[PDB]
Amino acid sequence: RRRVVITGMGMLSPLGLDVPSSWEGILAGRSGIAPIEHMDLSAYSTRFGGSVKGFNVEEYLSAKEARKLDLFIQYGLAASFQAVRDSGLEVTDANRERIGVSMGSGIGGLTNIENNCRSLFEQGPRRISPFFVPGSIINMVSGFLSIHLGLQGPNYALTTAQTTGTHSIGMAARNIAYGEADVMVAGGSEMAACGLGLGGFGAARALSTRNDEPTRASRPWDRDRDGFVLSDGSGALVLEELEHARARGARIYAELVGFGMSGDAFHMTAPPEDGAGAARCMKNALRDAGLDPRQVDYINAHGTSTPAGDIAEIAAVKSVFGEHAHALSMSSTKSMTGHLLGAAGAVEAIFSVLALRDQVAPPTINLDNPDEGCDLDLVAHEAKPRKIDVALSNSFGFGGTNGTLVFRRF
CA 331 to CA 337: how far, in whole Å? 13
DSSP assigned state of 322:
G
Does residue 160 bind its own copies (CB under 8 A)? yes
Q: What kind and span of H or E run contains 106?
A: none
**Nearest-approach distance from CB 347 to Mg ion, in angstroms:** 14
CA 142 to CA 155: how far, in whole Å? 6
**Nearest-approach distance from CB 204 to its own copies, in angstroms:** 5
Span interacting with its own copies, options 256-264, 302-310, 355-363, 387-395, rule CB under 8 A: 256-264
CA 156 to CA 341: how far, in whole Å? 19
List the one residue from 147, 247, 252, 327 that touches its own copies (CB under 8 A). 147
List the one residue from 63, 90, 94, 125 that touches its own copies (CB under 8 A). 125
DSSP assigned state of 289:
H
List the one residue from 116, 231, 366, 393 that touches its own copies (CB under 8 A). 116
Does residue 161 bind its own copies (CB under 8 A)? yes
Give 321's Cβ-side CA count (13 Å radius). 25
Q: Quick check: helix, strand or coil at residue 7?
A: strand
**Nearest-approach distance from CB 32 to its own copies, in angstroms:** 22
List the one residue from 3, 53, 174, 384 that touches its own copies (CB under 8 A). 174
Q: Which is nearer to its own copies, 69 or 360 (CB)?
A: 69
Count residues contacting its own copies (CB under 8 A)?
86
CA 348 to CA 338: how far, in whole Å? 11
Does residue 401 bind its own copies (CB under 8 A)? yes
Angle at 33 between CA 30 and CA 34, to 5 degrees: 120
Residue type at 318 in one-letter notation? K
Chain centroid to Cα 316, Å, comes to 20
**Nearest-approach distance from CB 353 to its own copies, in angstroms:** 23
Q: Which is nearer to ligand V6L, 82 or 305 (CB)?
A: 82
List the one residue from 64, 93, 124, 249 that touches its own copies (CB under 8 A). 124
Residues within the interface to ligand V6L (CB under 6 A): 18, 59-60, 81-82, 85
**Nearest-approach distance from CB 404 to its own copies, in angstroms:** 12
CA 195 to CA 39: how far, in whole Å? 8
